[PDB]
């Protein structure tokens, strides 16, 4: 039913790649 | 039913690539 | 039924590419 | 039903790759 | 039902790869 | 400069009240 | 400069009140 | 500079109150 | 500079109150 | 610079109060 192909070429990674990132950084 | 092909070429990554990022950064 | 081909060439990435980003940044 | 192929080529990784990262960083 | 193939090539890893990382870093 | 008064009366709460909620729910 | 008064009356709470909630729920 | 007063009255709490909650729940 | 007053009245607590909770619950 | 007053009244606590909780619960 569902098919997916992923091909990634990264030289230098400082962020997110195929990732899920959560940052609160709230202030009260 | 659903087919998807992904091909990404990144040299330097400082952000998000194929990612899901959440940032609150709320203030009360 | 649904077919999709993605080909991306990025040199330097500081933002979002094929991503979903959410930022609150609310103020109360 | 669901099929997925992942192929990643990373030279230097300082962030997240195929990962799930959570950071509170809240302030009260 | 569910099939997944993972192939990762990392040279130097300073972050997370196929990982789940949690960091509080809260302040009261 | 900025002044704000909040007064909320809730009987039963199943959603968000004075909150900031983020839901990805993306599909690739 | 900034002043804020919060007064909340909740009977039964099943959601978020004065909170910041993040849910990935992504699918690859 | 910044002043904030919080007063909360909860009878039964099943969710989040003045909290920051992060849930991955990702699928690969 | 920053001042904050918190007053919470809870009868029965099954969730989070003035807390920071992180749950991976990822699937590969 | 930073001042914070916390006053909490709990009858029965089954969750987190002024706490930081981390739960992996990942699956591979």
Q: Is H15 exposed, middle or buried (0-12, 13-18, 19+ CB in 10 A)?
A: buried
Alpha-carbon separation of residue E7 from C20, D7, F24, H13 (angstroms):
24, 5, 25, 44
DSSP state, J18? S
Q: Are C18 and B6 in contact (CB under 8 A)?
A: yes
Chains that touch E (3 or more CB pairs under 8 A): D, H, I, J
Report the C-alpha gap between E22 and E24 in whole angstroms.
Answer: 7
Report the C-alpha gap between C14 and D11 in whole angstroms.
Answer: 18
Q: After which residues is chain B discontinuous, taking C to N > 2.5 Å? A: none
Return the percent helix, strand and coil in chain E, to nearest 5.
0, 70, 30
Instruction: Single out the residue of D21, I23, D17 nearest to residue E12, CA to CA.
Output: D17
CB < 8 Å from F in window 1-28 of B: 4, 6, 18, 20, 22, 24, 26
Instruction: Single out the residue of A11, E1, I5, A22 nearest to residue H18, CA to CA.
Output: I5
CB contact under 8 A, C28 and F18: yes
Report the C-alpha gap between B13 and G7 in whole angstroms.
Answer: 44
DSSP H1-28: -EEEEEEEEEEEESSEES-EEEE---B-
> Tokens for I7?
């007053």
Report the C-alpha gap between A10 and B2 in whole angstroms.
Answer: 27
Please give the method by which this entry was determined. cryo-EM
CB contact under 8 A, J24 and E22: yes
> Tokens for E18?
């196929």
In chain B, what residues touch A25 (CB-CB under 8 Å)?
A: 23-25
CA distance J11 to chain E (A): 23
CA distance I17 to chain D (A): 13
Helix (H) / strand (E) element for J3: namely strand J2-13
CB contact under 8 A, H24 and D24: no
Find the closest chain B residue to F3 by CA distance.
Answer: B28
> Tokens for H20?
């920051």
Any bridge partners for residue J25, and if so which? none
DSSP state, C19? -
- Phi, psi (rounded to 5 degrees) for J24: -70, -75
Burial B1-28 (b: 16+ CB within 10 A, else e): eeebebebebebbebbbbbbbbbbbbbb
CA geometry: angle F23, G17, B24, nearest 5 deg:
45
* Resolution for this PDB entry, in angstroms: 3.4
Q: Are E3 and G28 in contact (CB under 8 A)?
A: no
Q: Where are the alpha helices (DSSP H) in chain I?
A: none
Alpha-carbon separation of residue C1 from A2, A3, G27, J25 (angstroms):
11, 12, 19, 35
């Amino acid at each position: 039913q569902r098919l997916a192909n992923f091909l990634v070429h990264s030289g230098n990674n400082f962020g997110a790649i195929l990732s899920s990132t959560n940052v609160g950084s709230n202030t009260y």
